[PDB]
């Protein structure tokens, strides 16, 4: 079988990036540049497009990886600029379908550095349309503009064959992404999402994550309900015996 592949990753209106699409590689994509170039920001954009849960997203420095610094800030707000931001992943499925998943991010006004994320998915988009253009409107002399979710929905619905969906919850987002072969596991529960994020976060910082190596049992072996039902039966028997004894 032909495994699906991430064709590209698009950042619109991030810190430094106004609208940039990196064409990922079948095997390996490398990002280079001096300190402060913006590589970790690119990976942050990718991870946010993948797991948009705001309970999980925490972009600590590669130093103090997992060490509580008392910062109180997850580090996501500072990577975005004012206005509407996008982060989309284009994926060619095993079925040769080009699906553009993504999120719309946007800073919340106020002292607290809080962000708002709204996922969305696009199916059937023609292979000739680039996500960089689809998310921007050419206003002025080669001076394109970023357009919000409502304008994007209007623009897409006016096209033929494209199906645009916006998700009221992350669970539906992950369910759709799993149905289209973009995630290995079905993240039905919050714990499943936490484990997925633990895996990608461990890869990001590289090497033996303490959280993973401390729960390799929870990560490798599957849960079994027969044992739990047997334990419940034994618990009920013990309860009845205790009742009679008392």
């Amino acid at each position: 079988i032909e495994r699906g592949k991430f064709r590209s990753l698009t950042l619109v209106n991030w810190n430094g990036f106004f609208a940039r699409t990196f064409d990922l590689d079948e095997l390996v994509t490398t990002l280079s540049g001096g300190n402060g170039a913006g590589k970790s920001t690119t990976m942050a954009a990718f991870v946010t497009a993948l797991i948009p849960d705001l309970t999980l997203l925490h972009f600590r420095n590669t130093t103090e990886a997992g060490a509580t610094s008392g910062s109180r800030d997850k580090g996501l707000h500072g990577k975005l600029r004012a206005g509407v931001c996008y982060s989309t992943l284009d994926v060619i499925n095993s079925r040769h379908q080009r699906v553009v998943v993504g999120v719309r991010l946007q800073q919340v006004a106020g002292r607290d550095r809080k962000v708002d994320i709204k996922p969305f998915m696009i199916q059937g988009l023609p292979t000739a349309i680039q996500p960089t253009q689809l998310l921007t409107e050419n206003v002025g002399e080669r001076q394109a503009r970023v357009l919000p979710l409502n304008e994007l929905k209007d623009r897409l619905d006016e096209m033929e064959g494209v199906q645009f969906k916006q998700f009221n919850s992350i669970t539906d987002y992950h369910a759709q992404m799993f149905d289209l072969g973009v995630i290995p596991k079905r993240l039905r529960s919050a714990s499943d999402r936490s484990k997925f994020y633990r895996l990608i976060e461990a890869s990001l910082y590289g090497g033996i994550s303490s959280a993973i190596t401390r729960s390799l049992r929870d990560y490798l072996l599957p849960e079994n309900s027969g044992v739990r039902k047997a334990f419940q039966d034994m618990e009920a028997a013990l309860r009845e015996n205790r009742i009679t004894l008392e």
Partner: protein, 94 residues
């Protein structure tokens, strides 16, 4: 005995899962998933998924196709098993 295409497909899926089920028991928590999958495949939405699943399960139970047992601990608080007539109807084709 009245099995429309959707009911027949749900019954066949139940039989297949029972064949591949470890200890030969079916809680309704899996019956609802199976009905969801068959209804999705048949591409018809007369009512909600839950109401259709419940109506079909009850119809088969009263039509002598499934047997229900009340067990609170079981997922869905019920355990369903194919009845001999249901076994015969399912294996006639399988």
């Amino acid at each position: 005995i009245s099995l429309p295409v959707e009911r027949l497909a749900f019954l066949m899926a139940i039989a297949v899962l029972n064949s591949e089920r470890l200890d030969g028991e079916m809680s309704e928590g899996e019956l609802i998933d199976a009905f969801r999958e068959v209804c999705k495949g048949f591409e018809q939405t007369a009512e909600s998924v839950a109401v259709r699943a419940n109506n079909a399960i009850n119809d088969m139970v009263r039509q002598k196709l499934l047997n229900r047992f009340t067990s609170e601990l079981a997922d869905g608080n019920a355990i369903y098993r194919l009845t001999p007539l249901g076994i015969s109807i399912s294996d006639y084709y399988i």
